[PDB]
Write an enzyme that holds these catalytic residues in place. Structure first.
Site, PDB file in Angstrom:
ATOM      1  N   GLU B  34       0.843  -1.214   0.000  1.00 21.70           N
ATOM      2  CA  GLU B  34       0.000   0.000   0.000  1.00 21.70           C
ATOM      3  C   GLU B  34       0.875   1.260   0.000  1.00 21.70           C
ATOM      4  O   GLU B  34       1.779   1.370   0.818  1.00 21.70           O
ATOM      5  CB  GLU B  34      -0.912   0.014   1.223  1.00 21.70           C
ATOM      6  CG  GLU B  34      -1.430   1.396   1.603  1.00 21.70           C
ATOM      7  CD  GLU B  34      -2.239   1.381   2.879  1.00 21.70           C
ATOM      8  OE1 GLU B  34      -3.415   0.996   2.819  1.00 21.70           O
ATOM      9  OE2 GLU B  34      -1.701   1.766   3.940  1.00 21.70           O
ATOM     10  N   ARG B 100      -4.091  -4.139   1.247  1.00 20.13           N
ATOM     11  CA  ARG B 100      -5.378  -3.397   1.178  1.00 20.13           C
ATOM     12  C   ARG B 100      -5.932  -3.215  -0.235  1.00 20.13           C
ATOM     13  O   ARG B 100      -5.407  -3.777  -1.194  1.00 20.13           O
ATOM     14  CB  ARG B 100      -5.350  -2.073   1.963  1.00 20.13           C
ATOM     15  CG  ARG B 100      -5.344  -2.265   3.465  1.00 20.13           C
ATOM     16  CD  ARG B 100      -5.751  -1.008   4.206  1.00 20.13           C
ATOM     17  NE  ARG B 100      -5.602  -1.183   5.653  1.00 20.13           N
ATOM     18  CZ  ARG B 100      -4.841  -0.433   6.442  1.00 20.13           C
ATOM     19  NH1 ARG B 100      -4.132   0.590   5.959  1.00 20.13           N
ATOM     20  NH2 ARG B 100      -4.809  -0.693   7.737  1.00 20.13           N
TER      21      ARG B 100
HETATM   22  C1  LIG Z   1      -1.636   5.401   8.629  1.00 16.89           C
HETATM   23  C2  LIG Z   1      -1.576   6.919   8.425  1.00 16.89           C
HETATM   24  C3  LIG Z   1      -2.827   7.390   7.670  1.00 16.89           C
HETATM   25  C4  LIG Z   1      -3.791   8.083   8.639  1.00 16.89           C
HETATM   26  S1  LIG Z   1      -3.460   9.374   9.502  1.00 16.89           S
HETATM   27  C5  LIG Z   1      -4.929   9.495  10.233  1.00 16.89           C
HETATM   28  C6  LIG Z   1      -5.306  10.399  11.152  1.00 16.89           C
HETATM   29  C7  LIG Z   1      -4.325  11.050  11.916  1.00 16.89           C
HETATM   30  C8  LIG Z   1      -4.658  11.977  12.906  1.00 16.89           C
HETATM   31  C9  LIG Z   1      -6.004  12.258  13.134  1.00 16.89           C
HETATM   32  O1  LIG Z   1      -6.464  13.146  14.074  1.00 16.89           O
HETATM   33  C10 LIG Z   1      -5.665  14.313  14.364  1.00 16.89           C
HETATM   34  C11 LIG Z   1      -6.987  11.611  12.399  1.00 16.89           C
HETATM   35  O2  LIG Z   1      -8.249  11.976  12.753  1.00 16.89           O
HETATM   36  C12 LIG Z   1      -9.358  11.578  11.952  1.00 16.89           C
HETATM   37  C13 LIG Z   1     -10.596  12.199  12.601  1.00 16.89           C
HETATM   38  F1  LIG Z   1     -10.837  11.579  13.914  1.00 16.89           F
HETATM   39  C14 LIG Z   1      -6.654  10.672  11.404  1.00 16.89           C
HETATM   40  N1  LIG Z   1      -5.687   8.498   9.788  1.00 16.89           N
HETATM   41  C15 LIG Z   1      -5.045   7.715   8.909  1.00 16.89           C
HETATM   42  C16 LIG Z   1      -5.738   6.527   8.261  1.00 16.89           C
HETATM   43  S2  LIG Z   1      -6.608   7.102   6.774  1.00 16.89           S
HETATM   44  C17 LIG Z   1      -6.116   5.976   5.523  1.00 16.89           C
HETATM   45  N2  LIG Z   1      -6.803   5.943   4.366  1.00 16.89           N
HETATM   46  C18 LIG Z   1      -6.478   5.096   3.362  1.00 16.89           C
HETATM   47  N3  LIG Z   1      -7.194   5.077   2.224  1.00 16.89           N
HETATM   48  C19 LIG Z   1      -5.395   4.231   3.535  1.00 16.89           C
HETATM   49  C20 LIG Z   1      -4.700   4.293   4.746  1.00 16.89           C
HETATM   50  N4  LIG Z   1      -3.655   3.503   4.956  1.00 16.89           N
HETATM   51  N5  LIG Z   1      -5.065   5.166   5.710  1.00 16.89           N
END
Ligand SMILES: CCCc1sc(-c2ccc(OC)c(OCCF)c2)nc1CSc1nc(N)cc(N)n1
Ligand SMILES: CCCc1sc(-c2ccc(OC)c(OCCF)c2)nc1CSc1nc(N)cc(N)n1
Ligand SMILES: O=c1ccn([C@@H]2O[C@H](COP(=O)(O)OP(=O)(O)O)[C@@H](O)[C@H]2O)c(=O)[nH]1
Ligand SMILES: O=c1ccn([C@@H]2O[C@H](COP(=O)(O)OP(=O)(O)O)[C@@H](O)[C@H]2O)c(=O)[nH]1
Lengths: 234, 232
Positions: B34, B100
């Site tokens: 990914e 994924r």
């Molecule tokens: C592993 C790092 C990627 C991140 S960073 C993140 C995130 C980080 C801090 C946040 O709050 C400050 C956050 O809040 C979301 C709202 F609560 C999300 N979510 C994610 C997951 S979103 C995602 N979408 C994809 N399509 C693929 C994937 N691997 N991750």
């Protein structure tokens, strides 16, 4: 050249593209028009149309937040509406011509480019957009690739007046200086030919350029004469 | 004839470790990491774009979620194409293991972000529209033959984020992991969640419990994969 010819009509905001394409479409049953997605958003209706008005209204309110979202959606809807009419319309025609109200290239090199240069997109937004733009418009062999470009040339002043004649409540706010930067970039790519694109064939794609400062709604013959002459060399 | 198998699961649940183990077992077995994980670490403009946008995403998800979700998925779609059109040539029993999928992009993370209010209705409806069609023109030959679900608890996961030592991740709360945990159960375990892709109703799922450490003890998980692949 195969089989429907594809020509983009290009020009500043309210330069007169939509008047001129409605004019051209009535002149031949062999000629059809794909109008701008954005131009229809500006007015129950469909999903894109629903989304369009929203992102359009938000784009007007805070463009440094919404330019990336507006631009990528405007481009998708365009690619969608053009690809649809490519097979959809003009099945039986000896000499079929699809007129586009603007192109994927104006989307990027006039509008997105300017929004970047004006700080409505940061560098990562512009790089992402360009990357997305490439990969995809490079997925289309020679299918939306144009055979020519009709540049409808105007002044920013003509364009400013024709915005108030048009009377779009939100558009009244568009400043003259904004029209100028878009105007300068139209002249650049189409007339002066400074702008280099990431698409090779564009530097060779024929361009017909038409001053449209004079009202043409009653007097388009010479314009259309220049359209027909141009289309017989392509 | 190339079989497509998506490996799903929460952050830190052990997906990259799994596929890394699997790829070493067979010449006929290949893997697509990914891209978000590639960025989660010289290189390319995608790395630069993804590097920057992941940081932005961590500081202000409410601003950057749409852009991030558009870019994570376009990068995946492309990544999966270059594997499919330039790898596994021309093996006897090709299997490509995607880390994924575009489905987990949409029906897990993008949906979760919209529920947690990081995208508004416009953004989410634009994303889905974008998603329904970006897959249609470019992502058709990516249709899944099966799915493997790596199931680990949110505590297991928090521990593993700790183990992995990514300092950018060291601030991800238990709460977030708990959210993504529910999203997977309803899609892949209870099999409730409905989608606009109808083939994804039939698709065979296999579920694997990876709560115990498996780096030196994976032979029984691999047997189930080998069994699952034969049913296909
Ligand atoms: C592993 C790092 C990627 C991140 S960073 C993140 C995130 C980080 C801090 C946040 O709050 C400050 C956050 O809040 C979301 C709202 F609560 C999300 N979510 C994610 C997951 S979103 C995602 N979408 C994809 N399509 C693929 C994937 N691997 N991750
Ligand atoms: C004319 C309707 C669409 C709009 S609205 C708009 C705009 C609105 C408010 C603005 O400041 C408050 C604004 O300034 C941008 C920053 F300089 C631009 N620019 C635009 C042009 S960007 C565009 N991109 C496309 N791809 C297509 C298209 N028709 N227009
Ligand atoms: O010769 C002309 C051309 C255009 N218009 C008007 O100018 C406005 C803007 O033209 P259009 O909507 O076609 O511009 P576009 O944005 O499509 O280039 C419209 O109200 C037209 O009716 C006009 O009065 N005379
Ligand atoms: O059985 C396991 C599974 C995972 N890990 C560790 O957990 C961390 C996160 O796992 P991985 O990167 O594979 O998780 P993913 O995010 O890809 O699901 C890694 O540093 C692994 O060393 C482990 O030690 N034993």
């Amino acid at each position: 050249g195969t089989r429907i010819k594809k020509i983009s009509i290009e020009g500043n905001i309210a330069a007169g593209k939509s008047t001129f394409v409605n004019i051209l479409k009535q002149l031949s049953e062999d000629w059809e028009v794909v109008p701008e997605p954005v131009a229809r958003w500006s007015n129950e209706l469909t999903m894109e149309q629903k989304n369009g008005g929203n992102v359009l209204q938000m784009m007007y309110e805070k463009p440094e937040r919404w330019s990336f979202t507006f631009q990528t959606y405007a481009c998708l809807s365009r690619i969608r509406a053009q690809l649809a009419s490519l097979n959809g319309k003009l099945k039986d025609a000896e000499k079929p011509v699809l007129f586009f109200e603007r192109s994927v290239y104006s989307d990027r090199y006039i509008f997105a480019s300017n929004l970047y240069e004006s700080e409505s997109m940061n560098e990562t937004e512009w790089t992402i957009y360009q990357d997305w733009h490439d990969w995809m418009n490079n997925q289309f062999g020679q299918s939306l690739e144009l055979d020519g470009i009709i540049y409808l040339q105007a002044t920013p002043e003509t364009c400013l007046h024709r915005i108030y004649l048009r009377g779009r409540n939100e558009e009244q706010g568009i400043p003259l200086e904004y029209l100028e930067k878009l105007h300068y970039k139209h002249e650049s790519w189409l007339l002066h030919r400074t702008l280099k694109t990431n698409f090779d064939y564009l530097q060779e794609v024929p361009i017909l350029t038409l001053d449209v400062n004079e009202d043409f709604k009653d007097k388009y013959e010479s314009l259309v004469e220049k359209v027909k002459e141009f289309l017989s060399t392509l």
